[PDB]
Amino acid sequence: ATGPRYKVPMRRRREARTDYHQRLRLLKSGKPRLVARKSNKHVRAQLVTLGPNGDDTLASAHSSDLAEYGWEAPTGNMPSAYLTGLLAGLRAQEAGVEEAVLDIGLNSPTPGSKVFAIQEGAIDAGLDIPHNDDVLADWQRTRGAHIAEYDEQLEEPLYSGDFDAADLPEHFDELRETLLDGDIEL
Amino acid sequence: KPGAMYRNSSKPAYTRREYISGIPGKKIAQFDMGNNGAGPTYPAQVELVVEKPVQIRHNALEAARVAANRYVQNSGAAANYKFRIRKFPFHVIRENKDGMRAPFGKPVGTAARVHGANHIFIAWVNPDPNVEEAWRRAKMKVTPTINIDSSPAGNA
Amino acid sequence: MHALVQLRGEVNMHTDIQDTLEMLNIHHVNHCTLVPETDAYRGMVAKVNDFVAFGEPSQETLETVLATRAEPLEGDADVDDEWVAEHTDYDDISGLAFALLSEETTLREQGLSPTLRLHPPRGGHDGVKHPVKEGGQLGKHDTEGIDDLLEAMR
Amino acid sequence: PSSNGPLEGTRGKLKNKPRDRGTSPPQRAVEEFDDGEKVHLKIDPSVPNGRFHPRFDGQTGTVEGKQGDAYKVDIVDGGKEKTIIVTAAHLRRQE
């Protein structure tokens, strides 16, 4: 920018998208990465490999194509997260992928966070991932109990129209249950 | 001492003051002479062009310069002309003044390295070349043979 | 295809230059070889440039030289038309020479020593202290220039 | 040389051009080579570990097994045959 001697950071660093130091440590395992990404309304989960011209995604799952399996709830929450993980986890298996390390990008390793949830799911899907049980959410919060109880302090539906008034962590079970056998794209 | 001791560019360029100390100051009084307030807006422009690469001690630079300018007072103290000595004595020169044991010398002076064909002096005058003579006296006090070249001046 | 003629001795000449001359089958002053015009060969004669004389010879000239100074890979045997025919893929000297110039074959391929050991130039050469453009005898020559030298050493 | 340490006279080869400054791309720090591959040895000024002795910068050896993550490359120093322990961060496939 200034002169010929100036140093321009790698693009993905300018864009503040890739932490290259953590990425190197990740690639160190020589295993596929379980990319766990977020958005205000959704949650993504990919299984990346390294490639000659860049990363290759062998299997992924998005909280949006979750409805395609009977999801009738919002998609930027814990129960959503888990499932997306489990979904990616499964397609993963179908792809012939067995083990992966958790790449949580520029997200913070907070306990009971959605990434960790994403990780829980993918693990249950059959994928072998280095992890730490007590950094994960307490199953109930995964199901979406923390939200159900939040609606209890109702007076006004937590969900603007949407589905239900008191919400349904059961809906969660129904979906998980579904995914664990047969069906298309899995 | 003789120009013989330091007139050749055979040694390495020795000018890093960050690594040299005790360098004697230059005897060159000024570089810009005449009406330095005015800019080169003169008809004629003559130059003193050195014909051989050599090293010129600040001694000879001053002696040469003085002899020329001091003479350019054929035009008067506040005459209409501007004189310029474009070279500066950067090359630090030593002397080994024990015989050849630990002989790296001590700074004794400085000199300017001029390459054959460069101009060491440049004057600016109006059809009134006393300057041409101011230089016959100048290349008289410098080691090389010189060429008095006139540039803008088809007023022969 | 150029004809190479070493004109300067070995004493004092760089080793890698001498070696190159040896790789081009020349081991004595006045010995001559016929080298193809390839990038690889080019780089070689450029390096040898100052101790040699080279250029493309005319058919006739090559023929004269071949007839007068060519030898079998072994022995005194004169390489004349008959020799050429009874031993090579051609029918006569001219047939051979042509193949050499057109770089279709070499002196070895035809069981001939790669070297044409010439005789000292009759009437002397133009000097080994200067190149051709200067009136000497070193470096690249004209087809008429090389012919003069080759013919004089015939 | 006024001293005989490994970095003696390495000001140039172990320094980066101002623009090549800073942390290097992980891609090449992870490259995988196979036994028999010809590889160019060059030190990444930006990468501290996995270095070999400066004297070999410029060599082109042959990967023959590895040791830990680091690789073991056979080079020939003058007339002497040697084995160099070097990480990928400092290697490139020839051709």
Added chain:
Amino acid sequence: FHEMREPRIEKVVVHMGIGHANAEDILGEITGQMPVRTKAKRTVGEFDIREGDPIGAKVTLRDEMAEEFLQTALPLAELATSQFDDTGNFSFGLDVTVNLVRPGYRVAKRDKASRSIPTKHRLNPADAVAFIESTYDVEV
């Protein structure tokens, strides 16, 4: 266009730059939340050689906490103009500073894909005077 362009108050820092404190107590009451120590850098003649050393406190107030404070602070000030930032900020007073900006500021304070705010979307001194002035008081 507007609504997402109209100014807003983001944090009001109240700090007392002592030189070595008990003052914290008053800031806590004057604001409504815990103050924060103020270590210093460098060693200096004002017997302030200690690097890590309490030498003041500050309180960053956001939302209502900030307004309810300014609804008494501003009144205690008169000044305006010149005393304003080039970014539409200003500090009066014990110190009280007001950081003003427009809606999409999180873009430059977040972690991921963060980005600096374009000069156009920045807040000018003028546009600042307007916002505040239009809130219980007068400029210059």
Added chain:
RNA sequence: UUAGGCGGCCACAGCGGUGGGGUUGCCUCCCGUACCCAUCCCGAACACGGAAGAUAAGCCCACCAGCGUUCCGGGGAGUACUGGAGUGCGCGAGCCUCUGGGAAACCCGGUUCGCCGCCACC
């Protein structure tokens, strides 16, 4: 790729600037703190929960060359420098010829306001 995610090369991608775009795939800003989690003080951030509003930021799309950068033409320049050769010149410093290579500054005019890979997706 009517706005996404992970990347490779790491400025041809930088700096600055103009115009355009969203009932939705979307991304954002944005709204909000019962929870998981969080600020040596602040739900600012981090984390979680969510859609009343917006396309003004960001972002994506199209474009501008003033600065920086890449590459190219023409000029500088076959100049500077140089591997090989010389009973060539010069008091000498040094130069010259032949042979094989061959620059930098700078100026004028173009180029450059990223290219490519995997995945997902009215």
Added chain:
RNA sequence: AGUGCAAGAGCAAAAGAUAGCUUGACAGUGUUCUUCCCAACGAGGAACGCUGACGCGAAAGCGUGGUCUAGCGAACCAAUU
């Protein structure tokens, strides 16, 4: 800028700062390079492994002292485990 000290070199979501926690400045045994270009030569140094035991971390992982190149010593004898 800083990174303990020469000089040159490396480093910015860090190799720097701050905070916290921790003792991997751990034991054992090697490969390779260096010391000694090429090309033989000791002590010493470094890079990289394996085994054991640990610290930290969500985890990949990092920690074989301080970012790299100086800060070192044979046999005999003594003390020590």
Added chain:
RNA sequence: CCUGUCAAACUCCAAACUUACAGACGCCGUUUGACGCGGGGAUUCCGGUGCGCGGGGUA
């Protein structure tokens, strides 16, 4: 803004050239056995000059 100069321990640039590996041609080797390996015997560790590049030195 304009204008005057420099660098063994400066570098936005940047040769010729030297250099690692590979292919090709050449040359060489497979009865003249190369490349390489093991062993016996040395001598040698005052050098000098020309050319190019040098560092010191008035030389």
